[PDB]
């Protein structure tokens, strides 16, 4: 069928990186291959009018959230993961609306703090991971050691697919480990199809006349070790999230990028079956389905447009179709909704399973909302994430407590911020993932709700959701740790911890108590 075909082309993925790894550099070089030259320049330019400044305050992002582009007859949906000033909870959430992930690692650094946390988010869905080691034009760690670093630190098996030849001032090129080809690193080239120097084999004549006899011999030495030690690429493993094919390159020069992109579109998974409150929803179904996973402000001179982001999981979207908002129950007509075909010639008014659409939100869409054509079904798997920045609410005029908690609880629905009411206090504690969510709730509470407020930091570092079967044994825990407990906007029990250390002690004192770092956004 027409849907099954279009879904089979889709490659929906995001990049996970520690900052300054190369995420925006490597995004540009791929937008080049998709023919999105116009967007490619604005993404590199992302490194002023008065009303756009106020819009920066309301929560818009300069870089486009979603970048779709075609490559080798596949449709590549590249969902952004803002890592800089706009880092926040939405960054963690984007990963739950993809099927595959590309990890970028600086070779000088290695695995880094943001690498580790993003990779943990991918472990939740067992998302497949591909690895690209960046910045080989400058000196860095040994590849053999960097593989063990990934393996031991990140926990995932390593199956390299390309392999470097030197690095830094001494970099000569990569060697493909499946095709046997030997791409060369050299100037004046964009490293594309016709614009590259590719030997078909290591034993091809003249290779030593190009990479030096010494470096060819040391390359034979390194391969013999990788062959008899590192594991070869097992697609079944990669698909189950238990293995990552590794690529080495130099994104700033587009070197090694294309082999990665060709390998990616060949093997990365097409849209798969997600789960709902009961039955599994396959991507080949006739009716349209999908879940809202992100809500942001859309660049608006009226400073009033919010757009909820929705990934499509079955059927076909067409501009102006009647949808079924399972929660509210009202028929919703997706009017003037947003597609993200970023290409100077290509322009498409529809979207297929794996794509993302932008539903202009007027206030009644919250995170995790499931849109269908009439089937009462509700997607599961959409998580809320344990905050990592906590602050208390500071209101100058106390006559706005009624309206403050009204605004706050709604900002929780739309994913602005989480909102915690301690069992032994009327304080209101706002958990976020990035600093920016606080300035946003500031403006939004003032602008929308008229509550001039402030957020002073508290002695809270991490939070865990609490669940336990035994009704009495939980109450022996509710009254024991009550000072450290709160309720969130959903009414779940949250252990607000002053430190990671206090939490581990808390986890051990209560052996029969579940401490989980995630929670479904559907009040359950
Ligand atoms: N030497 C070298 N520098 C790079 C490479 N890729 C990115 N950079 C540099 O890293 C800086 C910004 O990297 P960026 O793409 O913005 O990483 P991001 O912050 O994770 O998006 C720039 O100064 C780039 O010149 C590379 O392959 N080699």
Curated annotation (Swiss-Prot):
One of its GO terms (molecular function) is guanosine tetraphosphate binding. SUPFAM superfamilies: EF-G C-terminal domain-like (SSF54980), P-loop containing nucleoside triphosphate hydrolases (SSF52540), Translation proteins (SSF50447). It is found in: Cytoplasm. Coiled coil: none annotated. One of its GO terms (biological process) is regulation of translational termination. It comes from the Bacteria. Pfam families: EF-G_D2, GTP_EFTU, RF3_C. Residues 8-272 form the tr-type G domain. Keywords: Cytoplasm, GTP-binding, Nucleotide-binding, Protein biosynthesis. GO terms for cellular component: cytosol. GTP binds at residues 17-24, 80-84, 134-137. InterPro entries: EF-G-like_DII (IPR053905), EFG_III/V (IPR035647), G_TR_CS (IPR031157), P-loop_NTPase (IPR027417), PrfC (IPR004548), RF3_C (IPR032090), RF3_dom_3_sf (IPR038467), RF3_GTP-bd (IPR041732). Belongs to the TRAFAC class translation factor GTPase superfamily. Classic translation factor GTPase family. PrfC subfamily. Increases the formation of ribosomal termination complexes and stimulates activities of RF-1 and RF-2. It binds guanine nucleotides and has strong preference for UGA stop codons. It may interact directly with the ribosome. The stimulation of RF-1 and RF-2 is significantly reduced by GTP and GDP, but not by GMP. HAMAP family: Rel_fac_3. This is Peptide chain release factor 3. It comes from Stenotrophomonas maltophilia (strain K279a). The gene is prfC.
